[PDB]
Amino acid sequence: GRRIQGQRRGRGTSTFRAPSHRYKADLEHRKVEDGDVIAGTVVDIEHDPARSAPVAAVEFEDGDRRLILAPEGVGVGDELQVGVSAEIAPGNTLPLAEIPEGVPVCNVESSPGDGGKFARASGVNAQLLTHDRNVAVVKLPSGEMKRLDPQCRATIGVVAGGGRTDKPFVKAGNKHHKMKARGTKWPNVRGVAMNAVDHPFGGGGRQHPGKPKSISRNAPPGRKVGDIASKRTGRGG
């Protein structure tokens, strides 16, 4: 047959890429030799095209102007701080070690210094639970307990724009416009509606998958479609 859609994707052509040339800023934590003496003032609040959520512009003491993954409640004028001694308020970024347990955190680092990886979507937030001289236990937004180095820096508060998913798109046109700002091919045609040549589910006189939808993890790309390595399906039982 022909490569299925998932295979055209990898090639990274236009249709499948994100309009990076239209993105504002690779939101990443600042760096500080140490001390923590760093702090800047919120200058503006902008819309981040890449995440359909607001981001805050900031000017630091050393005259450094950069956009920041904004938590909720951060307004212009506000003064944020980034360092080991940074105050324990919303908006400030500091190593989990200095953050008190039970505090909602966002934009957490996987490895200290990576500048943030976890919890960065609209309104999500991690949860610092356990402290240790060795491990800091964070409960990610997926509900998973993540064991992190207490040296991994993170921002206090929950990500801004929460509740964005509550309103339906209502019409194709609204998806269209949003989709156009992401690295995604849209709309979606179901395999079952295609020709056998184009997808493992294609063909037939009527529309239905030609085999059970649950595919093996070891399946080769081109054949791995439907329910990937499903531990189970359905809602019952």
Contacts of residue 219, defined as CB under 8 A and 6 or more positions apart, other chains included, come to none
What size, in residues, is the chain? 237
Burial (0-12, 13-18, 19+ Cβ within 10 Å), 236: exposed
Report how far apart the first and last C-alpha atoms of the chain are (Å, whole number): 38
When CB distances are held under 5 to 8 angstroms depending on the partner's kind, the choice from Na ion, Mg ion, RNA, none that residue 73 binds is none
Interface with Na ion (CB under 5 A):
203-204, 210
Residues of span 171-200 touching Mg ion by CB under 5 A: 188, 190
Q: Half-sphere exposure of 41 toward its Cβ, with a 13 Å CA cutoff?
A: 5
**Residues 23-42, interacting with RNA (CB under 7 A):** 23-28, 31, 33-34
Strand partners, 65: 59
How many chain residues bind Mg ion (CB under 5 A)?
6
Is 142 a binding residue for RNA by CB under 7 A? The answer is: yes
The encoded tokens of residue 86 equal 């940074």
64 contacts Mg ion (rule: CB under 5 A): no
Q: Out of RNA, Mg ion, Na ion, none, which partner does residue 218 contact, by CB within 5 to 8 A per kind?
A: RNA
Residue 35: is it exposed, middle or buried by C-beta count within 10 angstroms (0-12/13-18/19+)? exposed
Give yes or no for residue 26 binding Mg ion (CB under 5 A). yes
Query: Which residues, 6+ apart, have CB-to-CB distance to 200 below 8 Å?
Result: 4, 191, 209, 210, 211, 223, 225, 226
With binding defined as CB under 7 A, does residue 182 bind RNA? yes
User: Which residue of this chain has its Cβ atom nearest to Mg ion in the complex?
Assistant: 26
Binding flag, residue 66, RNA (CB under 7 A): no
The item of Na ion, Mg ion, RNA, none sharing an interface with residue 226, based on CB under 5 to 8 Å by kind, is: RNA
**Which of RNA, Na ion, Mg ion, none interacts with 124 (beta carbon under 5 to 8 A by kind)?**
RNA
Choices 35-43, 81-89, 91-99, 193-201 (CB under 7 A): range interacting with RNA: 193-201
- Contacting positions for Mg ion (CB under 5 A): 1, 26, 188, 190, 207-208
